[PDB]
Curated annotation (Swiss-Prot), chain A:
GO terms for biological process: cellular response to oxygen levels; gliogenesis; mitochondrial electron transport, NADH to ubiquinone; mitochondrial respiratory chain complex I assembly; neural precursor cell proliferation; neurogenesis. This is NADH dehydrogenase [ubiquinone] iron-sulfur protein 2, mitochondrial. Its main location: mitochondrion. Keywords: 4Fe-4S, Acetylation, Electron transport, Iron, Iron-sulfur, Membrane, Metal-binding, Methylation, Mitochondrion, Mitochondrion inner membrane, NAD, Oxidoreductase, Respiratory chain, Transit peptide, Translocase, Transport, Ubiquinone. Its cofactor is [4Fe-4S] cluster. Dimethylation at Arg-33 by NDUFAF7 takes place after NDUFS2 assembles into the complex I, leading to stabilize the early intermediate complex. It comes from Bos taurus (Bovine).
Swiss-Prot record, chain B:
GO terms for molecular function: NADH dehydrogenase (ubiquinone) activity. It comes from Bos taurus. The keyword Transmembrane applies. It catalyses: a ubiquinone + NADH + 5 H(+)(in) = a ubiquinol + NAD(+) + 4 H(+)(out). Its EC number is 7.1.1.2. HAMAP family: NDH1_NuoH (MF_01350). Pfam families: NADHdh (PF00146). This is NADH-ubiquinone oxidoreductase chain 1.
Swiss-Prot record, chain F:
PANTHER family: NADH DEHYDROGENASE [UBIQUINONE] 1 ALPHA SUBCOMPLEX SUBUNIT 12, NADH-UBIQUINONE OXIDOREDUCTASE SUBUNIT B17.2. Complex I is composed of 45 different subunits. It is found in: Mitochondrion inner membrane. It is a peripheral membrane protein. It comes from the Eukaryota. It comes from Bos taurus (Bovine). Keywords: Acetylation, Electron transport, Membrane, Mitochondrion, Mitochondrion inner membrane, Respiratory chain, Transport. This is NADH dehydrogenase [ubiquinone] 1 alpha subcomplex subunit 12. One of its GO terms (cellular component) is respiratory chain complex I. Accessory subunit of the mitochondrial membrane respiratory chain NADH dehydrogenase (Complex I), that is believed not to be involved in catalysis. Complex I functions in the transfer of electrons from NADH to the respiratory chain. The immediate electron acceptor for the enzyme is believed to be ubiquinone. Its main location: mitochondrion. InterPro entries: NDUFA12. Belongs to the complex I NDUFA12 subunit family.
UniProtKB/Swiss-Prot annotation, chain G:
It comes from Bos taurus. Belongs to the complex I 20 kDa subunit family. Keywords: 4Fe-4S, Electron transport, Hydroxylation, Iron, Iron-sulfur, Membrane, Metal-binding, Mitochondrion, Mitochondrion inner membrane, NAD, Oxidoreductase, Respiratory chain, Transit peptide, Translocase, Transport, Ubiquinone. Its EC number is 7.1.1.2. This is NADH dehydrogenase [ubiquinone] iron-sulfur protein 7, mitochondrial. It comes from the Eukaryota.
Length: 378, 309, 176, 56, 69, 144, 154
């Protein structure tokens, strides 16, 4: 038993017998930054930017999950236009994540070219982030109550122009990998997980669907306007790395299908709840109306109070079920905020999934779980 | 006059290797929708010089080596052997005209594995020695097919003289009667030089002056394999009164084969170690043995046995 | 609604079996992959010639901070400390007193740019458009201390960048 | 968009796709970087009567 | 554009062209403007040694025709 | 078209005013494209556009060789772009300052400065507030 | 004797800044923007900056993300193993001074407590262009070195 001591940074303590992996012991905490404790010293608005920085590949999806939880405790709802923007940018965020997941998974096992092609596509999607929020990544754009600002004029046309060509970029990626015998040798029958083991080990997202489980929170527990768009849920059959890769590629195509509907069905109206005890008033109103200035002053200093209570809220994030257990004590700062990161349970399953495989397969299995250590360590 | 001739081989080889590093970075760049080096000199033409100077004035960090003698031997062996592989190459005239030139090249390349072995012994580390032993096991395995494929081809040539391959391909390239062997020959060179998708020393390890010398040796070998592939399978017609016409056509084929190494590196993922061993022992070797049998029989049954000389 | 990504039975007739045999022995899918990277070789690259060319940005871009003035030259900041209260990173430190003319003005206005998360919450909170994130993003330094901005530094940034900052605010204030 | 006809044919054939119809580089199809000013709508609570906060 | 890769390819091409061109030219210069004699077998070596004696100047590449008859 | 491609390459030498001007932009900017001169700022930077080029390469600047007393023939820096052209160069707007000049203010810097880090002009932080506790000063006349 | 030394500094300075091989500590978010600077739009390789190099061949360490207390000893170990000349670029607020986690019990308040830093790139994250500006600034810093001039005045 040869012992070896070695997204973020990971420490793998492994035991090998020849080529085989007897035990994988992930040692994490290398990016633990006490986010959950820091949030207890923030107002609800001040805590929002911490959620950009968990799964820092799916920023607005994390924002959405936190906003929905706070909206639930506030007993308000965001306006319909904000909900459509949140689904629109939620799916753009899904594309950002699967590009990162699929091409870096490919790059880690030597297939480096698709990374460069598809990161030019990510670069254009960062522009959409920056045009609505002024930041390429940590937008802090989706907030409890809706979104911070309305889409700039001309943005939806440019998203249409981008989406019209994307599936061809997916086709090119498939031409590199899908039928490649070398790619299939690295993924087929690697890291098989049974449907029953997947549920008991706490897996979610593609880690469940690759094994045939028919589960997607956007279909079964829909949020915002996901019940108003049409899409299919990709389902695997072998529960291995290859089927999960195919599930991710097909999910990108379905995201384009959703994005197309969001662009066409985008309604008019306001974009944050018309309730100035939760969402700040417009700047022009703040500068003319006494009530607006008082509410602006209080929302940016004390923040809004949230009725006491606890909620577990979850979304189908690109990496799987992402949730928060959010406890309010009635004040304007959360009492406790436990973040449920899907990668946490997935990485805990690495030892189980690596059994009977070789050292290089551990690289494929970590890649097929889509691990970002910002969400794993928090 | 001969010492002039030696230098007209050695110095250009090292120059070609230097600028292969530029060509590799730019070809890979453009296949990746980017440009690669284009700032350091016009079109990056000074990038190899900057890299070479930078490497040679870098701090030479020697960890506690187990054997000082073997720490110096391995790069000297690697570079000296790489340069030696070129002296029988007919371009169209060899520097040394060897009766058994093909065997000499076979004999010399089989010693190239010692520099891997000695560098693991010199690394003073258990994990580096283990990585070196995996590389050796890969290298010697693909030596098996290369030697058998080479023998199969020479049954059509009739000689171990490299310049006879030119005569053999006067009417037609050997790739036509022997493309199944050319296919496995070409893949074998990639795995032999530990090139992608067989770059497992880099892949497995991922999970100054002396470094540069090992790199130059490796890249000198990559060009030489592809020169050898061009002579073996894409023979250039030689006109004795205009030998430079051979050299130009010869050079173009060699450059194109060398860039196909680059093209391949940009296109595929990496093999698993056991998977590239299976590729050799369970796929190439069975088929090379059958084709060796076939190529022994074919000249006899067609009445196409080549002349001894 | 769902679909199967990989639920197919290969045809076992002789023509289909020979097609798979030809692919295995003649490496056809691998040759097809080489066609794709070859096609990219002859595509115009996506690289821009930085710093002679720049990546596109919008008026909302959150960059280096700056303190602004009214057209008269009076400071806009009135030391309300709303920016300091909202700052998620506690990157703002403010002190104030009545100025010699009786005006409500700051005597300290520091932003620790290495605490700051460039979230833009301060420019949303400001009631008078005094603190903004400007369009500059090329201000890296050789020392840590150079990134601990005091009021003088921030006012100079305002005087340095106001021409662009005023134009950007003009383009986006109707969205605020 | 400036590739010669021979090069366009070569890369289309090598990829097996008509790449010119879906270029990954952007040209004039994108929206102007100066836009007319917006006039954003107001929400349902922007009313002068029948709008007491205790009802919403 | 892709043709900006050619300069580096051109430098490599010229570098790989020099050894073959130089070897050929050095052979002609050293062998009276002819190809270097190839002697792989004893018969060829014997003729070359005979030619060196016949030349009268101890050079195998200096030929003698019917003017010595 | 192989001939037409070479003609355009030759036209770029003429477009940059001869071989010397062609080689100067090649070695300063690693790019020999000829564009339309949009304008020039007071520091000597020149601004070009070519809308046949793809988004991102359709606008560029050729930096001056001398700015605020610094030799910038080889040492160009992104911070050398003054704010009024910065908006146009980064495509925050479509209007160059020649067409839509910035609003004039008396306190706006007349002279732009580039990044001064690592020079004697670098910023050095300090506390901008005055001393808070005043010490008692003993009398200067003895009377113990 | 003095003209020669100045020219030899220029040569070695040119070679080192023209051939800057980075080791990236992709610790967190900022590593994503580093990947974008490698991606085609910016293509750091076109400046002579190789996409990835092992520490033993590295000239510059880019600290791209939050440095936790748990990770600090490992980051110092990698830095000590770099052959010289070696430079450190601190990228983003976390590495600069702790950023948004500055008050955390588990976070190093700036990577310059562990290693000497040559360049600080502000932002959360800095844009890929902002990182590239930082890298070019480091190149200018190397260009100002006068190692042989100081050596011969010793
Ligand atoms: C292979 C070698 C082919 C040589 C032909 C070069 C050429 O003309 O290509 C450009 C030309 C334009 O291509 P493009 O992609 O459409 O360009 C986009 C714009 O149209 C282009 O329009 P533009 O507006 O951008 O044009 C402006 C451009 C002007 O563009 C040009 O004029 C390109 C000039 C290239 C001439 C090189 C001739 C080859 C010399 C051989 C030496 C290298 C090999 C050894 O100005 C420049 O930038 C010129 C600066 C100098 C560039 C440096 C080139 C020197 C190379 C030689 C190194 C010597 C040292 O190509 C063609 O028109 C197609 C026919 C050319 C033959 C193609 C054969 C492809 C290879 C077969 C497949 C095998 C793959 C495996
Ligand atoms: C073997 C000898 C190799 C000699 C290499 C010659 C170096 C050429 C060179 O310096 O590049 C031009 C460079 C060009 O300057 P640069 O490197 O600052 O580049 C400026 C242009 N941009 C902005 C695009 C980067 O000249 C110099 O910088 C001065 C260094 C001279 C070193 C030569 C000493 C002899
Ligand atoms: C599918 C992907 C395959 C990837 C594998 C890599 C392939 C690389 C192929 C490299 C060889 C390409 C050949 C390029 C031709 C060289 C240029 C030239 O001028 O050669 C002319 C030659 C005809 O002349 P010649 O070779 O002398 O044949 C006479 C018989 N001895 O040739 C005339 O056509
Ligand atoms: C038309 C006329 C032609 C008829 C030919 C029929 C030959 C059929 C042989 C196929 C037998 C077979 O099924 O072999 C496969 C099996 C080894 O398979 P393996 O990869 O180790 O693991 C399988 C699990 N996936 O079983 C084996 O162990 C492989 C068989 C042993 C290896 C034989 C190697 C042949 C010798 C190599 C040289 C070629 C022949 C002489 C030259
Ligand atoms: C008339 C009677 C005549 C008698 C003689 C008749 C013989 C002719 C018919 C037989 C033809 C034999 C073909 C020889 C090529 C070798 C075939 C081969 O071994 O491929 C199979 C190998 C493994 O295939 P796999 O699908 O993974 O699994 C099968 C094993 N269980 O798969 C591989 O090897 C994959 C290749 C790995 C390398 C990938 C990287 C490069 C690929 C592109 C290279 C382009 C081609 C290069 C050409 C070079 C030219 C110099
Ligand atoms: C191939 C042709 C090259 C022609 C150019 C010839 C120029 C000769 C002058 C070389 C100058 C080398 O410059 C010097 O290199 C060594 C690396 O070995 C660096 O490193 C050295 O200095 C540091 C301290 O400064 C030491 O801790 C370190 O152990 C030591 O190796 C120096 O930081 C650098 O100042
Ligand atoms: S941008 Fe955010 S973190 Fe930075 S000073 Fe403003 S409010 Fe604070
Ligand atoms: S900058 Fe604005 S928010 Fe901050 S103290 Fe001054 S006036 Fe108040
Ligand atoms: S500086 Fe900002 S973007 Fe970078 S790692 Fe820290 S939180 Fe993430």
């Amino acid at each position: 038993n040869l012992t070896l001591n070695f997204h973020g940074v990971l420490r793998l303590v492994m035991e090998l017998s020849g080529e085989m992996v007897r035990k994988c012991d992930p040692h994490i905490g290398l990016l633990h930054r006490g986010t959950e404790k820091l949030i207890e010293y923030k107002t609800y608005l001040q805590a929002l930017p911490y959620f950009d920085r968990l799964d820092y590949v799916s920023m607005m999806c994390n924002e959405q999950a936190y906003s929905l939880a706070v909206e639930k405790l506030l007993n308000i709802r965001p306006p319909p236009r904000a909900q459509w923007i949140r689904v629109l940018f939620g799916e753009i965020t899904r594309l950002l994540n699967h590009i990162m997941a699929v091409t870096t998974h490919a790059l880690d096992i030597g297939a480096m070219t698709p990374f460069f092609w598809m990161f030019e596509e990510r670069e254009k999607m960062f522009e959409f982030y920056e045009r609505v929020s002024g930041a390429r990544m940590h937008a802090a754009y989706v907030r409890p109550g809706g979104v911070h600002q309305d889409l700039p004029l001309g943005l939806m046309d440019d998203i249409y122009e981008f989406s019209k060509n994307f599936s061809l970029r997916i086709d090119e990626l498939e031409e590199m990998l899908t039928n490649n015998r070398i790619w299939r040798n690295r993924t087929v029958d690697i890291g098989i997980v049974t449907a029953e083991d997947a549920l008991n080990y706490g897996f979610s997202g593609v880690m469940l669907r690759g094994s045939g489980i028919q589960w997607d929170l956007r279909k079964t527990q829909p949020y915002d306007v996901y019940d108003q768009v049409e899409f299919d849920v990709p389902i695997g059959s072998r529960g291995d790395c290859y089927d999960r890769y195919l599930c991710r590629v097909e999910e990108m195509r379905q995201s384009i299908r959703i994005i197309s509907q969001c662009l066409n069905k985008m309604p008019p109206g306001e974009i944050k709840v018309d309730d100035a005890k939760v969402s700040p008033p417009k700047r022009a109103e703040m500068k003319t109306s006494m009530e607006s200035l008082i509410h602006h002053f209080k929302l940016y200093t004390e923040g809004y109070q949230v009725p006491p209570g606890a909620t577990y809220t979850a979304i189908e994030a690109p990496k799987g079920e992402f949730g928060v257990y959010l406890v309010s004590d009635g004040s304007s700062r959360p009492y406790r905020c436990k973040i449920k990161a899907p990668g946490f349970a997935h990485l805990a399953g690495l030892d189980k999934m690596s059994k009977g495989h070789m050292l290089a397969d551990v690289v494929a299995i970590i890649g097929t779980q889509d691990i970002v250590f910002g969400e794993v360590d928090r | 006059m001969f010492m002039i001739n030696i230098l007209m081989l050695i110095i250009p080889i090292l120059l070609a290797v230097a600028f292969l590093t530029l060509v590799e970075r730019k070809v890979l760049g453009y296949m990746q929708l980017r440009k690669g080096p284009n700032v350091v000199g016009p079109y990056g033409l000074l990038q190899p010089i900057a890299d070479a100077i930078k490497l040679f004035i870098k701090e030479p960090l020697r960890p506690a080596t187990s054997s000082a003698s073997m720490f110096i031997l391995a790069p000297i062996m690697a570079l000296g052997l790489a340069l030696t592989m070129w002296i029988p190459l007919p371009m169209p005239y060899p520097l040394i005209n060897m009766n058994l030139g093909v065997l000499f090249m076979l004999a010399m390349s089989s010693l190239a594995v010692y520099s891997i072995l000695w560098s693991g012994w010199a690394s003073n580390s258990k994990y580096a020695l283990i990585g070196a032993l995996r590389a050796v096991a890969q290298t010697i395995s693909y030596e098996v097919t290369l030697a058998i494929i080479l023998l199969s081809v020479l049954l059509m040539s009739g000689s171990f003289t490299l310049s006879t391959l030119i005569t053999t391909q006067e009417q037609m390239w050997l790739i036509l009667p022997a493309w199944p062997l050319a296919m496995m020959w070409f893949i074998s060179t990639l795995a032999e030089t530990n090139r992608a998708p067989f770059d497992l020393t880099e892949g497995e390890s991922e999970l100054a002056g002396p470094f540069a010398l090992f790199f130059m040796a490796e890249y000198a070998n990559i060009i030489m394999m592809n020169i050898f592939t061009a002579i073996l399978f894409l023979g250039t017609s030689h006109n004795p009164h205009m030998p430079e016409l051979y050299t130009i056509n010869f050079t173009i084929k060699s450059l194109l084969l060398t860039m196909s190494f680059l093209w391949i590196r940009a296109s595929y993922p990496r093999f698993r170690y056991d998977q590239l061993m299976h590729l050799l022992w369970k796929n190439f070797l069975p088929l090379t043995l059958a084709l060796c049998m076939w190529h022994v029989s074919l000249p006899i049954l067609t009445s196409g046995i080549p002349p001894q000389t | 609604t769902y679909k199967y990504v990989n639920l197919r039975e290969p045809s076992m007739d002789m023509k289909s079996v020979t097609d798979r045999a030809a692919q295995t022995l003649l490496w056809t899918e691998l040759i097809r992959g080489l066609g794709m990277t070859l096609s990219y070789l002859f595509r115009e690259p996506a690289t821009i010639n930085y710093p002679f060319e720049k990546g596109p940005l919008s008026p909302r871009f959150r960059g280096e901070h700056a303190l602004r003035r009214y057209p008269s030259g009076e400071e806009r900041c009135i030391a309300c400390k709303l920016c300091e209260a909202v700052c998620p990173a506690q990157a703002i430190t403010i002190e104030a007193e009545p100025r010699a003319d009786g005006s409500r003005r700051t005597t300290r206005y520091d932003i620790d740019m290495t605490k700051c998360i460039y979230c833009g919450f301060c420019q949303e909170a400001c009631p008078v458009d005094a603190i903004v994130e400007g369009p500059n993003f090329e201000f890296s330094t050789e020392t840590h201390e150079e990134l601990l901005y005091n009021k003088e530094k921030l006012l100079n940034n305002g005087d340095k960048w106001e021409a662009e900052i005023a134009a950007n605010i003009q383009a986006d204030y109707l969205y605020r | 968009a400036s590739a010669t006809r021979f090069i366009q044919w070569l890369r289309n054939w090598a990829s097996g796709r008509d790449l010119q119809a879906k270029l990954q580089l952007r040209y004039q199809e994108i929206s102007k970087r100066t836009q007319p000013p917006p006039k954003l709508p107001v929400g349902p609570s922007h009313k002068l009567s029948n709008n007491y906060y205790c009802t919403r | 554009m892709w043709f900006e890769v050619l300069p580096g390819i051109a430098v490599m091409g010229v570098c790989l062209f020099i050894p073959g061109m130089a070897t050929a030219r050095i052979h002609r210069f050293s062998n009276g403007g002819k190809e270097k004699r190839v002697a792989h077998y004893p018969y060829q070596w014997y003729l070359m040694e005979r030619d060196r004696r016949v030349s009268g100047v101890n050079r195998s590449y200096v030929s003698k025709g019917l003017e010595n008859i | 078209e192989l001939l037409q491609v070479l003609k355009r390459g030759l036209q770029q030498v003429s477009g940059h005013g001869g071989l010397r001007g062609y080689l100067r932009v090649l070695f300063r900017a690693n790019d020999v494209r000829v564009g339309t001169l949009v304008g020039e700022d007071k520091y000597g930077n020149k601004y070009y556009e070519d809308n046949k080029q793809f988004f991102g390469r359709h606008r560029w600047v050729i930096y001056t060789t001398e700015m605020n007393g610094k030799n910038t023939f080889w040492d160009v820096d992104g911070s050398m772009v003054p704010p009024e052209w910065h908006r146009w160069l980064h495509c925050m707007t479509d209007d160059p300052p020649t067409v839509k000049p910035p609003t004039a203010r008396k306190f706006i810097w007349t002279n732009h400065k580039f990044n001064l880090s690592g020079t004697p002009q670098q910023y050095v932080p300090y506390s901008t507030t005055r001393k808070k506790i005043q010490e008692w000063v003993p009398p200067s006349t003895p009377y113990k | 004797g003095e003209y020669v030394v100045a020219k030899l500094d220029d040569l070695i300075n040119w070679a080192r800044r023209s051939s800057l091989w980075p080791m990236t500590f992709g610790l967190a978010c900022c590593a994503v923007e580093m990947m974008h600077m490698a991606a085609p739009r910016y293509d750091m390789d076109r400046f002579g900056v190789v996409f990835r190099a092992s520490p033993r061949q590295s000239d510059v360490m880019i600290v791209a993300g939050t440095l936790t207390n748990k990770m600090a000893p490992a980051l110092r170990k990698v830095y000590d193993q770099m052959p010289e000349p070696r430079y450190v670029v601190s990228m983003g607020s976390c590495a600069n001074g702790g950023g948004y986690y500055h008050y955390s019990y588990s976070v190093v308040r700036g990577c310059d407590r562990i290693v000497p830093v040559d360049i600080y790139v502000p932002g959360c994250p800095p844009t890929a262009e902002a990182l590239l500006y930082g890298i070019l600034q480091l190149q200018k810093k190397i260009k100002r070195e006068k190692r042989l001039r100081i050596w011969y005045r010793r």
